[PDB]
Design an enzyme around this catalytic site. Sequence first.
Site, PDB file in Angstrom:
ATOM      1  N   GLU A  33      41.311   5.081  -4.139  1.00  0.00           N
ATOM      2  CA  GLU A  33      42.610   4.161  -4.086  1.00  0.00           C
ATOM      3  C   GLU A  33      42.425   3.118  -5.317  1.00  0.00           C
ATOM      4  O   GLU A  33      42.910   3.185  -6.472  1.00  0.00           O
ATOM      5  CB  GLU A  33      43.218   3.703  -2.989  1.00  0.00           C
ATOM      6  CG  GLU A  33      42.457   2.808  -2.358  1.00  0.00           C
ATOM      7  CD  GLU A  33      42.814   2.296  -0.877  1.00  0.00           C
ATOM      8  OE1 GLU A  33      44.299   2.252  -0.768  1.00  0.00           O
ATOM      9  OE2 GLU A  33      42.264   1.526   0.019  1.00  0.00           O
TER      10      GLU A  33
HETATM   11 ZN   LIG Z   1      46.591   1.976   0.187  1.00  0.00          ZN
HETATM   12 ZN   LIG Z   2      44.509   3.488   3.102  1.00  0.00          ZN
END
Ligand SMILES: [Zn+2]
Ligand SMILES: [Zn+2]
Length: 332
Positions: A117
């Site tokens: 992420e």
């Molecule tokens: Zn996140």
């Molecule tokens: Zn996460």
Amino acid sequence: NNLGSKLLVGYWHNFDNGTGIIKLKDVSPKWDVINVSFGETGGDRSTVEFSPVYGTDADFKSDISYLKSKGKKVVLSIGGQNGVVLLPDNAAKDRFINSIQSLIDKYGFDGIDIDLESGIYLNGNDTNFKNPTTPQIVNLISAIRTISDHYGPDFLLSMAPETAYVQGGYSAYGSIWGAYLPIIYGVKDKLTYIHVQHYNAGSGIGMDGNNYNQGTADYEVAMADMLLHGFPVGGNANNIFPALRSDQVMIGLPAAPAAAPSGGYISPTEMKKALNYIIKGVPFGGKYKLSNQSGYPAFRGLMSWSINWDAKNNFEFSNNYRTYFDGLSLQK
Ligand SMILES: [Zn+2]
Ligand SMILES: [Zn+2]
Ligand SMILES: [Zn+2]
Ligand SMILES: [Zn+2]
């Protein structure tokens, strides 16, 4: 790869976060794929490292071989708080490629899962998902293709981006918004399946331009349908992200309410409504209208965070969904 047509993919904690450690041989056989979580990084944010949370290296390798002999797949997931991967240039990309191959060789992993992420985003002027220009994205695609090419057609590749990075591309293309679209497209011929995290997500806009709330049947259908059908990117009717094969599309869900502290958990009763609509085209009185009336029978299955949370929650997820998938009698 001998993977079944309806899968349960479960994340496996290589750590004790309070839910306990489950040794590989003690993992429920109802999981088809085990995503070992996580390969992590240090100072250089590129050399991936991994050490089994329990026992010796040799014994972990043996445990993996055992599972593989029973038809299971064991995949190394890269990500988590301590697994930030930054590939600004060729030097970084090579450290990443080499460290991953070394780990796959050492333990016998069947493939890798991309659960990154932090670090993933589109730079300004990076406007075309078919031809990305952001180094992180370009280099990640290159590394993934190189690793997969190294192991051949049986290599398992999965990814678990959050919705903003995929379906969010419907709203905007830039920064994190739609940022996994070029990654997905760039490795689509190598991609075994994608299981977007349908949780800790708030709401999501469907291809019908309507807003849907996480943890509801309508939301699950609306979000999956975008990958099953394809969708226009960033409000541009002339920029369509193509459909994936249905057998490349899964949905990621929390195994228990506490597995996604910001929401997203859905009861099996409600989720089975979504599944019956997606797979069989059988509606349930929801607001969302499926893109293909007759359904997407080759839809690949469900992912969960996590095996460990599932075991702490009376095996609700694994038991409910294994029975559901086992009970399908699809004709075609
Ligand atoms: Zn996140
Ligand atoms: Zn996460
Ligand atoms: Zn090679
Ligand atoms: Zn259509």
